[PDB]
Design an enzyme around this catalytic site. Structure first.
Site, PDB file in Angstrom:
ATOM      1  N   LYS B  97       0.817  -1.189   0.000  1.00 43.46           N
ATOM      2  CA  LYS B  97       0.000   0.000   0.000  1.00 43.46           C
ATOM      3  C   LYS B  97       0.855   1.245   0.000  1.00 43.46           C
ATOM      4  CE  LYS B  97      -3.912   2.073   1.974  1.00 43.46           C
ATOM      5  NZ  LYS B  97      -4.859   2.040   3.095  1.00 43.46           N
ATOM      6  N   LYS B 353      -8.194   5.261   3.076  1.00 45.10           N
ATOM      7  CA  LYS B 353      -8.704   3.915   2.859  1.00 45.10           C
ATOM      8  C   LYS B 353      -9.081   3.670   1.400  1.00 45.10           C
TER       9      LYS B 353
END
Lengths: 439, 457, 463, 460
Positions: B97, B353
């Site tokens: 990520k 997110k």
């Protein structure tokens, strides 16, 4: 030589009087002359200091105990002059259903009834209606008798429209209060104060925390923080506090207004005004209100300029003024059916006529709703719902098109429903819409 | 009985512990036995505790005490640890990520170090950076590090343990990281722990690389290194107000003299309603924590680190229901003497997110100052605008494709799009914008267009 | 010849009597000029009843504007204007465009009407030149009574505005050849202008030349170079009648051309062209020449030819049907075909700066864009518009009536970089739209398209 | 005449060159299967109206029930054998393998339920009833795999396979491509498996043949009281449960008294002209349930005699890359005509509730019906007694889809007609009432909101 030709036709309209009307005939004209003379004769250098304007600090002074006292030296006036044709319904904006099954007018006498029956006091309510509202509201004032209320209604002056090439005188006309004679009446009894609130505002109750700083100055103008929602509206120059309006702004400083802060000021239209000070200004003719253009054109005729004055414009004429902050609890005006869906929801609790935001709405923020074009008409509004849904946990709602709601629906989070043109969308009963896009 | 079916799952791993590749043997034994050590506690598994007004403090009371002078300060007592054990497949990307681009285009990792440089290159100091990456992310993150040499920042890596995916119906093993509680044991076991306390550093600052707002703050640090007349601190918990945005998380309470953590699952049934308002719980677990180095050594030696066992279900994708025994970092304050967390502005908690947050955070709504970004005006109301992009927008590559530039937002409040929509350069979103293209139709919004309080069907 | 010229005589006799009837009809004291009008009809009719190929045009009879432009402007004083008459053609409404009224009253820019911009133009002459140019409008019963009530707005200005009406004629029947119990067009001007007692007034006030243009042509304007050419002419010839011509686009092949027929010029129009050679008229170009209906005419010359019946103009047929009725003919004439009769008549070739007929809303847009700039009532393409190219704008039927056109464009979009535009069906533009390249906006039946405010459509097909 | 024996013995030798390719041990069963065909083909080559069925030969269940229950002990169960028909997959429902194994409720598979029943019987009554399954080459090894799970439930379970026959060709009249020859092939197989002689040795006297679709096929004590200890002396032998016809179930089998005995009749056997009168006029209120009660004794007696008379069901089928071919079969019901003293008894539709399609499932896993100890029965407050009518479209056909579309099974107590078609989904807690039509045209989607109550509505 160009104002002497309009007044000559203002002398040519006195002899077209129905004989009896002559008392308020020669006077309403003689007011238009006092304001037509200000039409053709027409900062920044001071910002409001800290020593001028909070709510939660007055509550710690704070509340006089107990009966009454003090509740007896006060008068309550709510405005009426206004149709709800914009809403849909032909007639006064006072006679529309809000909460089952009371109207604006009903909600007001409900509030007064609770105070009279508990503090042993007799506080009179007053309407300031227009010529388009008095015939109807007078006919229904009979259903308020045998309630612990005093009632005193009176008209406002009639003003002649003028043409661009060659109507009610605004809400600031309250010139009329001395004309009807109730000015001299109310003062000579024991009262010392008048409380002006609009009827559209349903949070504008009479406060006892403010009645401490009022009883035992003179002029109070209530205020609330500006919000992205309501950008334009009214906001200390040369000693005294001066009202500043959106239209009075020079060409240059448009960017300086709204942004940023700068200004936190907003016009609440909820005011307390001293009785004995009115007679020191209404008789000597020293009330300085600013007059606005307000030239619209409806329906199929020339552009007409309708001159009007503002209530909050007479602070510059009043002495020893100071304003105080009031939280959004006590300001909640209703304009469109999107406000109706709001107020009549289980978002507000109902208590003795005056309503407050409820538990347990977890976050203290109004979830505003945008209703489509086909909900604007109040007759169509109730058609499409009947069964005002659950909204205790709603955040944003937007409907547009031919949409119908069944009974007992729950709306939660963000709800968007959009019927295409010449499509119908029928929401079934008991349905729970949560963060959903209904095309 | 419960032992006689546990000694089966213990001798089932003796067959795979001889399936060991010579060298990689002792870090394999260490973990599997630390798996047994959780499995045991897994079988055995209030309320009178109302939270106090003395432990949990307002930021406003620290921020103005305040600024630690001068040169400097010391700051050389601190270690910045960042959690980097998370893949980013929910955002669409194959891999870590951290390696997803956020602005111009600095990546998550890029942005952190750019902070640590501006510190050290203005305060004549040498603060380290420490990444904890799991077996998923360690490989790929190492190869892309050679780009940070001759940046004034010493960077360090260490891996999270590797536990077996146990069976719901079978309760037998066939791999996953044990969450983020694993830090205490895996950071000791690497050797790094002893290094940093050896250099004289006494405070470690853990956070998530997701939380773009998680920035090293002097004012808090001052409260720690040279504390206010008193004792402490073995542990600190950054905590923010509750938003409708995030209703399930943790809350910090005082059960039995020490402050505990409470997760939504730990709640028996007849009290789940009670959690998350009545608003006697506006505490939110930010996950931005300071800890003491000296403190960790003591408590880790004697196994004195007590955490609540998280038990996660997933059967995904094809196969039986899987049981993942995990531990969290928060669930271990009660085992640290003298705990207190402070209240923090939402400025300090901005986790990215979804692809929808990216938009918000790479708009003209935020201004960047070499690493660390802030909610820069002009902005009238302070309110964070709602943004909800559809399923056509989830994968990053698609998101980036769809916008030929990131539209102006400084006066937006709500924006919802769904369908095959596609934007332009200089587009200006203002108010409440709704754009919806139905199954088969396409909307492309012309360049430099100004949508203000509109609905495009 | 035998059985054919008996019927023809009985036709001209039968109508005449049914017109001797419609004379005293009509028994109104105000005869002026009814009897004359009906003596103009029977003149046309008698011709209609009794009723090429020759050469191409010669190279000295038509001239390029630059040759003349560069000679150059008069010197004195001038004061050459004092022999001129401007005549605008106001025989026509805008029910095409969709307006209750004279086309001469629809607004163009900011927002002056065709006739505002006309008088603004003359004001500016007289002002900078201490001169007094007279303006004449040749309108119709449709157009006069309406505009007259407005002509009092141009008070205090520096113009003398003059009016007249050209005749009424009754519409003949396509089946039966009988008058039902119309304005014969712009070609009637000669007769009517003279009969009105103005030809004579001006000739006896020291004028010598008349500048006829349309009111629809915002480009047709007084030009000191072409004026120099008639007033004080080269060598001393002495002409008389001069007709501005342009080069033909694809835009306009369906026009009229000049060609030498038997020793003089004649205006040859689409209609009078034989069935077999209709193609060779359109092509090759070649015949690159097309009529502007900007004309300069000598007043002296009119009299001599009018009072002596000699202006030979071609007859138009013009069959029309409206509204719940069968087929009706209608007899009209055209200014231009008069060249035939005049002497030393010549045509000069003009830029198209000078020719902008505002006939459709398509045309209006262009002409209220930023593609032109208004100065003293005249407007001309403006720098910076780089390629000199003229864009082509086709609006849909949803944009025909002016009242719609205005509401559909919240503002007028930026042009300047247009190559092609084509809009058709239900569309709408907001404030500050910028159009560039080729823009196509098609919306089907039942659909809407609202280009958001500030959009920049370059080479896109919006649907 | 002479050609027939030619085409009958041509077949004989053609099969003879197929035994020669049988895996050592497979033979003793393969040959008996192939000599089974020899006989059917032989019948197939050689191949009313006076039939209206009497009063006394068909009885109303209510009379029987009111007699009523066995006293001792009973422990009348000891002489019974429960047989359930397995051969038959569920590919038409969108499932691989045996139809027996689809999830019905909780999810209990079809077979989960019948054992659940037999067990509760044995446990409350201290008796040990056996369950025998008659599967076929398609549903056998697949089922046996799962049988491991019923260990330590109180049911001895059994299996046997029905025969396997050659597909003969339409044009050729030659065999090729194998099939199970109908359920009627129970008499031959049951004999050959040896269970028949085994059971008649443990002193059982009767089997209860029924279907695994039939959820209603309870083991009913009152019918039993009539068979063991029969009233009056007789003594029969073959008993056919039988119900009333609904417009729903018109094209069925009905009993008639053809020449002395009862005889079954199928629409396929009726002459062209009289097809109109079969299937109403009712008249024929009677309809075959295919719940049967048969004497073990009797089977054996008549099987040795080859005396069991069934009619040949001639089947045409050609799918998918095959050619036109016949598939000779037989019906179990068909055998009354050759048994003795045989009688039919009319039985509430309660006993007859087959789940053949995905519509049916929705109905049965509703809250309309109610589940106890494996058996399920409609119940309260389903006020008006009638069974609601459900027609799901071609989208809901596959079991896997059907579940994805219903985010929860919806309320149906108050439901009278439900009919959907096209691309539709259902939220949770939906309630359906009255008549509900939900129709979504090609290219559209209807997503019903959760908590919805659709009461007498068209949603298009």
């Amino acid at each position: 030589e160009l104002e002497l030709s309009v007044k000559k036709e203002l002398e040519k309209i006195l002899t077209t009087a129905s004989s009896h009307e002559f008392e308020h005939t020669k006077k309403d004209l003689d007011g238009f002359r006092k304001l037509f003379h200000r039409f053709l004769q027409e900062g920044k250098i001071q910002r409001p200091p800290e020593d001028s304007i909070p709510y939660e600090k007055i509550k710690a002074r704070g509340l006089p105990d107990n009966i009454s006292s003090v509740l007896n030296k006060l008068v309550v006036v709510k405005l009426n002059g206004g149709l709800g044709t914009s809403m849909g319904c032909k007639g006064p904006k006072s006679l529309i259903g809000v909460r089952n099954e009371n109207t604006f007018l009903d909600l007001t006498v409900q509030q007064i009834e609770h105070l009279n029956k508990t503090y042993n006091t007799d506080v009179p309510l007053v309407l300031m209606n227009s010529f388009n509202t008095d015939e109807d509201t007078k006919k229904i004032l009979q259903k308020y008798n045998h309630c612990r209320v005093k009632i005193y209604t009176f008209n406002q002056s009639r003003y002649p429209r003028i043409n661009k090439e060659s109507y009610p005188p605004g809400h600031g006309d309250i010139a009329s209060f001395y004309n009807s004679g109730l000015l001299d009446t109310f003062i000579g009894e024991g009262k010392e104060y008048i409380f002006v609130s609009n009827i559209d505002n349903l949070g504008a109750t009479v406060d006892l925390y403010i009645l401490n700083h009022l009883m035992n100055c003179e002029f109070v103008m209530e205020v609330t923080n500006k919000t992205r929602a309501d950008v334009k509206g009214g906001t200390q120059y040369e000693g005294k506090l001066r009202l500043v309006e959106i239209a009075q702004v020079p060409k240059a400083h448009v960017d300086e207004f709204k942004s940023v802060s700068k200004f936190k000021i907003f016009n609440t239209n909820n005011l307390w005004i001293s009785l004995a000070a009115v007679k020191r200004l209404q008789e000597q003719n020293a009330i300085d209100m600013e007059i606005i253009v307000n030239a619209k054109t409806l329906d199929g005729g020339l552009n007409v300029i309708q001159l009007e004055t503002a209530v909050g414009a007479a602070i510059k004429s009043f002495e020893n003024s100071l304003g105080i902050n009031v939280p959004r609890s006590r300001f909640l005006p209703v304009k469109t059916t999107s406000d109706l869906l709001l107020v009549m929801s289980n978002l507000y609790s109902l208590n003795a006529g005056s309503l407050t935001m409820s538990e347990k709405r977890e976050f203290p923020t109004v979830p505003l709703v945008k209703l489509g074009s086909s909900f604007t008409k109040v007759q169509d509004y109730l058609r499409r719902f009947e069964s005002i849904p659950d909204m205790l946990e709603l955040d944003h709602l937007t409907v547009s098109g031919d949409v119908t709601f069944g009974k007992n629906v729950s709306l939660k989070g963000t709800v968007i429903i959009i019927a295409n043109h010449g499509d119908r969308i029928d929401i079934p009963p008991g349905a729970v819409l949560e963060n959903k896009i209904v095309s």
